[PDB]
Amino acid sequence: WTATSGSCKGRCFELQEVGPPDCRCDNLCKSYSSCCHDFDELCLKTARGWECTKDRCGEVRNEENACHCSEDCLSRGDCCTNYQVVCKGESHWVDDDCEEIKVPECPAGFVRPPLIIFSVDGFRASYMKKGSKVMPNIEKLRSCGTHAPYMRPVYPTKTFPNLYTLATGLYPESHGIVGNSMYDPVFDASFHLRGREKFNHRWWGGQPLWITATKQGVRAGTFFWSVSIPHERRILTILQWLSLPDNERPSVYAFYSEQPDFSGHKYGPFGPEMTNPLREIDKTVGQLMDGLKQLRLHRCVNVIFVGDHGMEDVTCDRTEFLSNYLTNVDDITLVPGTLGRIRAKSINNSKYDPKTIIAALTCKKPDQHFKPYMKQHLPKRLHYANNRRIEDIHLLVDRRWHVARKPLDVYKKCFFQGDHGFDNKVNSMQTVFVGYGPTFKYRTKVPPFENIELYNVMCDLLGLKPAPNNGTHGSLNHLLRTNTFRPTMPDEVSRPNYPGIMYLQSEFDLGCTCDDKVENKLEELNKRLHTKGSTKERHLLYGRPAVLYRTSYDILYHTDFESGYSEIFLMPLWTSYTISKQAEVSSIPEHLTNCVRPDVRVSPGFSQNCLAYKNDKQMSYGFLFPPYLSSSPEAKYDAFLVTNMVPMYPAFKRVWAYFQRVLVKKYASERNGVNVISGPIFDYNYDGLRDTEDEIKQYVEGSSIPVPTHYYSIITSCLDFTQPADKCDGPLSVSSFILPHRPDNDESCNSSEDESKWVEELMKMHTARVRDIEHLTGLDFYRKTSRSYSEILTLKTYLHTYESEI
Ligand SMILES: *[C@@H]1O[C@H](CO)[C@@H](O[C@@H]2O[C@H](CO)[C@@H](O[C@@H]3O[C@H](CO[C@H]4O[C@H](CO)[C@@H](O)[C@H](O[C@H]5O[C@H](CO)[C@@H](O)[C@H](O)[C@@H]5O[C@H]5O[C@H](CO)[C@@H](O)[C@H](O)[C@@H]5O)[C@@H]4O)[C@@H](O)[C@H](O[C@H]4O[C@H](CO)[C@@H](O)[C@H](O)[C@@H]4O[C@H]4O[C@H](CO)[C@@H](O)[C@H](O)[C@@H]4O)[C@@H]3O)[C@H](O)[C@H]2NC(C)=O)[C@H](O)[C@H]1NC(C)=O
Ligand SMILES: CC(C)(C)c1cc(S(C)(=O)=O)cc(-c2ccc(Cl)cc2)n1
Ligand SMILES: [Ca+2]
Ligand SMILES: [Cl-]
Ligand code: NA
Ligand code: NA
Ligand SMILES: [Zn+2]
User: Fold this and answer.
1) SS3 360
2) Residues with CB under 5 A from ligand 5 (ion)
């Protein structure tokens, strides 16, 4: 019930929302069907439109008008935004030359530069260049401020998950808005874009910027806008709030545009119909900036112009139907479109089986345009699993396509030409970032970054402590003139043991054999030196990784590689090695094919054993430092130590062996040497964070050897590739992966072919940030470089995407 008989007199766009049944006059009252009876009359005036004209100048105030052109309008804070241009001979902001804003130039009584976030739905990154001729205001913000060539959204690349990620710095799996449509099985409730369930607070996790601000005594404008409020009124409302007395005036504001997404869905991302929506958005930006200029705030406020996601060409005919694959299509519920999510239609159906659904959807048609995954097997960079609102079965849909359950869903539930939602590395889904104002840099281009980083920066711009989030605070310090956040490296928690030779060969009963009893004061001192760390500067180039949790581990040195060996997990946490451009690949010699060697520095009780692998008919083994890249026949023996061995399914060994034998050398050739750190990952509860020992679900049969769910590598070289990786004077360059450790290659439909035709494709799909590996391992990398820590934070957030140029 709403008692709509109250009034909006002196309450239009009030900031504190009133509770039912009292009627509302706020930004969202229309969305709740709750506005007072006179809200339209008083708060949505339209008379005489939005622009001053010559004959209106100095008019007698008429309170009915949508905006004013009378002499008193500046003191009232309600002139039309072009008032000074039309009536007082001023220029439009867009016509003024750009001039650096070295310090805030703010009116008396301003405690901090306000922040205005201007968000645009469906604003594909390439519109900044492609549309630049029709967007002069936006192009000025872009060229004069700080801009990225594109900003990466979160998956899925849908509006509500991305707006709420912008607000919170959280992945959707953590903030809980994992789609525009959701079912939560604990609430037994459904969330939809249409209707009332979405306003319930139980869906919205984390702490969004407006709450962070309010809790710390910084007043916020209402961020949300009912779709029917025209954009001109939204801007005039912001501008009126900026005229409030100091004690009443917000310091942070948001505008949102439903364009260009609205037209993009109808016309495609580059339909000829798209130029007009881009012009209209640019006109709105001009209204804001002219309005700020009238208020003498245009060199005071920080403005962020930011998008939620891009837009791709998608038409009805490019739809895959689950009814062409499944016998049981009526026993499943599908959340359809540019991603698929499947669960049982009925929890009482005991014949429902996810394994048979996945198999029926796997590599069934030659050009199949989606791929099924259990959610824990999705690329870890998506961070899309740890939430009960995310169904166990996920379909990753190829760009330009849709998946649906049955054909009747697509013609009885063809008009549209654009959509979005795909994998967040796809070029068409990239969106925009420009920052302009005293706190941002002047005429500065920054590399692409992820939208999870922006909450921390918005907190920095407002002097707020951010709530715990998934950004890496300091990684965006290079966007800022001032207000940088200068963190300190985390403290190492566990220090390593440095074991020497402490065990005789006969103390070991591991079931291993090696033909290494084939046998000098000159060369023996030399090899003792290698076991002591004499080559460690060549192979550990950025310092030892720090271990950020409590554990027992040993540093083990070798001619060609260094490792941190866990006594608890019985394998290395990390293995580090450098491969120069001139490095030679060799074979594993015949007599060494089955060689595994006890490590006399590590007790039998803390070692793996070969007998467990013999007995486990599903499990084989690989090595973390590859025997193929040994520096010499004698050094190669080190690579067969039991302390370099890790459990690997034979299907996975196909992948790993190709990476090690072929790809490492290729990268060294292409990058002028590489440094490689590789290791296992254990994430059995798919929360993106290192498992403790009691979370491990699988072991090598009969043993305490834990099976990794993933294997990583971090491949680092000199950004200036004219210098070798091991003699690099300046910035670094990195690419990483987190490969799923699976007992089949069903993910790769072409895996019956030679590894040259499918393995690198798999590795690209599973590209990762160093930061993703840090979460998953509790390790902290790049501890010892000569680079600034914020520079290293940016490096750690880099994602190598393998998409061609935007
Ligand atoms: C991205 O950044 C975020 C933010 O930093 C990281 O997320 C944090 O991760 C922590 C570890 O997973 C987690 O810490 C836990 O918090 C529990 C208390 O949680 C509540 O309070 C906080 C603070 O206000 C709040 O934010 C939480 O909000 C979550 O839950 C509600 C309701 O479901 C949602 O609306 C909201 O969206 C959010 O959900 C998300 O996180 C939860 C986990 O909390 C997931 O389940 C959801 O899927 C979703 O992803 C909560 O309201 C606390 O109780 C936990 O403590 C247990 O474990 C510790 C181990 O240290 C142990 O000492 C305790 O005894 C305790 O164990 C007991 O409970 C167990 C489980 O029932 C049981 O098995 C035991 O036997 C014991 O009884 C724990 O400290 C923190 O909450 C989240 N925060 C957020 C916002 O998500 C995220 O990790 C980052 N991602 C990456 C990849 O780095
Ligand atoms: C997704 C929610 C409902 C929380 C939402 C709605 C709207 S709306 C379309 O304008 O109602 C705007 C924003 C918003 C979030 C973050 C940022 Cl930085 C700016 C704006 N968020
Ligand atoms: Ca985990
Ligand atoms: Cl043995
Ligand atoms: Na085996
Ligand atoms: Na396959
Ligand atoms: Zn859309």
Assistant:
1) helix
2) 613, 616, 619
